[PDB]
Design a protein around this ligand. Sequence first.
Ligand code: MKI
Ligand code: MKI
Lengths: 304, 304
Amino acid sequence: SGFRKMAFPSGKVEGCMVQVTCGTTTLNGLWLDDVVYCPRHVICTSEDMLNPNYEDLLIRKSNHNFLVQAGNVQLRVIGHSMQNCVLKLKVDTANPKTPKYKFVRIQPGQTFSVLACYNGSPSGVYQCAMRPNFTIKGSFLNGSCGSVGFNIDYDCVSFCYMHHMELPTGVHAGTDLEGNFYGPFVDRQTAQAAGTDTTITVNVLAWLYAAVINGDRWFLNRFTTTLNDFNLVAMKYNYEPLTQDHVDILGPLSAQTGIAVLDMCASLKELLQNGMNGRTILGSALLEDEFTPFDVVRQCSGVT
Amino acid sequence: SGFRKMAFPSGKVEGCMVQVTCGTTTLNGLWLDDVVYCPRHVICTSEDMLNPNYEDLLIRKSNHNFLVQAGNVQLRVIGHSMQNCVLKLKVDTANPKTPKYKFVRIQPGQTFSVLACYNGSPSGVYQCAMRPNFTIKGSFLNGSCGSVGFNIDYDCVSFCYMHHMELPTGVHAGTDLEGNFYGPFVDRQTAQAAGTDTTITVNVLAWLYAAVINGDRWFLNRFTTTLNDFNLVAMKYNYEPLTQDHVDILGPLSAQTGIAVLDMCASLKELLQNGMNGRTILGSALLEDEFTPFDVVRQCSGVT
Ligand SMILES: Cc1ccncc1N(C)C(=O)Cc1cccc(Cl)c1
Ligand SMILES: Cc1ccncc1N(C)C(=O)Cc1cccc(Cl)c1
C-alpha cells in the first residue's frame, strides 16, 4: 500500500564522495577505483567561467594543484586528464568502498536518484528524471557541482549524471560520467535557455497503473482510443508522442491490472481534456511523470 | 535553485539492516551495537494475529528460534526480551557499522526518512511525515515490517519509527524504537480506523517560504491577518491550529525573505479560500505539508 517518490538507497554512492579543490574552487568528486571524476570547471575562477578555454587553463595545473580529500584524509594525485567536460584525477589509492559500477548515458524520460553533496559530504537523496529538454529539475546550490545521479540493479550502481550547471531559469544541466553534456548545454557562464519541457507520457500512464494498483480508480472511464488519436491530444497538451515501444513497456502493468494500454490512454485523454476537477491521484493534484514503468513495477513488487 | 522532497542519505541506516526470522515469519531488524530491534509480531503466524497474546506466544520461543542474518552471515542470539511492541535480540557481536545514534519519539507534523527494506535488504528511501492522526503515508508491502524512519544531525542518526502495520485504508502505523505505537494503534489484525488527517499548517507555511526563496511568488498577496482570524479559516479547511510556537519556528524563514509570518498566513488564507486556479507552487498543484521549517532551512542552506 502507498506510492512514494522513492530514491534508491544511497550508501554505495556515499562511500564514493570526495571533496576536490583546485586553487580557490571547491566541488564534489566521485572516487571509483583509483580515479576521481569531477566537473572540469573546478579549474576555473569566476572570471574564467565567462569564456573559459579549458585546454589552456589546464596547462597551468599540475597533479599537486588538485587537492582530493576523502573524509578528512588526503589522496595523492598521480595523474590528471580531461575527458570532454569532466576531469579524471588518477589517485595512488583505490577506493576501498568502490561498489560494482557502470557508466551509462540515459535517455530523456528515464529517472534516477541524485545524492546532493557539498564539500564531499552528502546532504540528501531525491529522485529526478531526465526531462525531454535534457535538463533535470534538481535541488542544488553553489558547492553541489560533482554530485551524481544513479540507478542501482541489486549490487551494481549505474552512474548516469554529474551535476555541472544551473541555468538562469533555476533548472539544472549536467553530463554523463564520460563528461558529455545531456542536451545542448556548455560549461560556460553564458545564457543558455532550455527547450520545451514536455510531459513524459509513458511515465504518466505508468503512474496511472500504480494508482489503479493502490486504490485510486475514479479516473478510469468507459472509453478507449487509438495511438494516433491519443497522440493528437498529447500534442495539444505538450505530452511526448506515445509509440508502440512505450505500449510494449507498459505491458506488465496492463497485465497485472487487466486494463489495456489504449484504455488507460483514453482515461489520460479525458484527464487532459477535463482536468482533475479538484480531485487527487496518489496524493497529487497534477499528473506525475517522474516514475517510469520500471519504477512502478519495482516499487509495487518490492525489488531490493 | 529547486526544491525537492529530499530524504537523508541512507548509508548509515543500510549498515544496520538485518533479516529476522522466527519460525515461518520473516521481517526486518535494526542492528545497533549488540542488539537487534524488530516488531514483536515476528513471533506470530497469520492465525496468531487475530487476537495475539504476545507474552504467552513468547514463552514458546527460545534464543535459537530467532534467526538473525546480516548480509549472508548468521548472528548468534544470546538473549531476548520484549519491550512494549518491539523485540530486542541480544546478539554476541556488536554491529561494526553501528553509527552514532539516539532513539527519539517524534511529534505529529515532524518529518523523517524511511529506508524501506525487504528480507534485511534496502529497496529505497523516501521522506514521510508523522500525520496529525499518528499514521504515516508510506510505501510498504508485506515483508517491509521492521523498516525504520530516521533523521540525521551531521553524524548522529535519531531513529524515530519502526514500521509495524498497514491499516485497512492503505495508511501505515508503527512504533518508536522503544516499541511504543504512535497513536492509538495495536499490533493486532483488527479493523482500526484512522482519525482526521488534518493539514500540518506550520509545514505549509514553511513550504510557501521555500517557494518564495526559489522564485514562485504569484501567491503573495496584499493582505495580512491575525492568529485568531487565520485559525478560523484553518479550522474550516481541516488545517492544524497555528500557535505562537509555530510562528517562532518560522522566524528564520520570515527573516530571510522579509515576509512577516502573519502576512504569509494571509496568503495561505487566500489560497485556501480561492484555490490555486490551475496554477502550481514548486511543481505541485496542492499545498505541500511534509516539509518542516527545519527541512526548508536545511535544504535551502545546504546542511550536510
Ligand atoms: C550556483 C549553482 C547552483 C546550483 N547548481 C550549480 C550552481 N553553480 C555552481 C553553477 O552553475 C556554476 C556554473 C556556472 C556556469 C557554468 C557552469 Cl558549468 C557552472
Ligand atoms: C501487508 C502489509 C503491507 C504493508 N505494511 C505492512 C503489512 N503487514 C505485513 C501487516 O500489516 C501485518 C500486520 C497485520 C496486523 C497487525 C500488524 Cl502489527 C501487522
